[PDB]
Structures are given as structure tokens and as C-alpha cells.
Amino acid sequence: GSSGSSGESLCPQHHEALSLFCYEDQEAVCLICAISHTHRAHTVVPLSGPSSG
Ligand SMILES: [Zn+2]
Ligand SMILES: [Zn+2]
């Protein structure tokens, strides 16, 4: 089909499993970004929920 493995995305720069999400920028980020100059002092929040796991 159109998609192959619909599991998780990957940063367009780090290509890492995107699980985090910045608040200010209002966009998705990765483990790296979180601890990067770009979103260093930014409010990053996890995109996980107590529902699934
Ligand atoms: Zn990243
Ligand atoms: Zn940010």
C-alpha cells in the first residue's frame, strides 16, 4: 500500500524516532533537538500517553 511501516516518524535532519514535541515552536522534535541549540532552552513535551503503555 501507500505506506509500509506506519510506526514512528523520523526527524528531517536527525532522522531519529520522533517522540518529543516542542511547545513554543509548536512542532515535533527528536531526542537530539531537545538537547540542541535550536530547542535548547525550549519547552519540550513528550508525545506519549498513559493509555497505550
Ligand atoms: Zn531532531
Ligand atoms: Zn523549540
XYZ file of C-alpha atoms and ligand atoms in Angstrom:
55
model
C 0.000 0.000 0.000
C 0.880 3.692 0.113
C 2.714 3.325 3.425
C 4.916 0.444 4.532
C 5.626 0.523 8.261
C 3.354 3.037 9.991
C 5.071 3.125 13.369
C 7.005 6.321 14.041
C 8.372 9.306 12.118
C 11.976 10.493 11.853
C 13.460 13.977 12.214
C 14.029 15.561 8.777
C 17.524 16.456 9.978
C 18.382 13.865 12.627
C 16.241 11.079 11.167
C 15.528 9.852 14.697
C 12.299 8.411 16.099
C 10.186 11.496 16.798
C 8.644 11.094 20.252
C 9.025 14.612 21.650
C 7.340 17.870 20.644
C 8.322 21.492 21.263
C 5.739 23.877 22.712
C 6.967 27.312 21.637
C 7.821 26.280 18.077
C 4.649 24.182 18.165
C 6.281 21.383 16.174
C 7.625 17.846 16.563
C 11.237 17.156 17.537
C 13.626 14.314 18.357
C 15.929 13.296 21.209
C 18.737 15.352 19.676
C 16.784 18.545 19.004
C 15.608 18.513 22.620
C 19.240 18.883 23.684
C 20.226 21.081 20.741
C 20.991 24.789 20.366
C 17.768 25.188 18.385
C 15.423 23.949 21.112
C 17.925 24.063 23.975
C 16.003 26.392 26.288
C 12.610 25.447 24.848
C 9.623 23.766 26.499
C 9.620 20.262 25.019
C 6.832 17.818 25.864
C 6.530 14.043 25.321
C 4.095 12.768 22.691
C 3.272 9.649 24.707
C 0.160 8.752 26.677
C -0.659 6.563 29.700
C -3.335 4.913 27.557
C -1.266 2.760 25.200
C 1.541 1.908 27.604
Zn 15.942 16.456 15.549
Zn 11.635 24.807 20.204
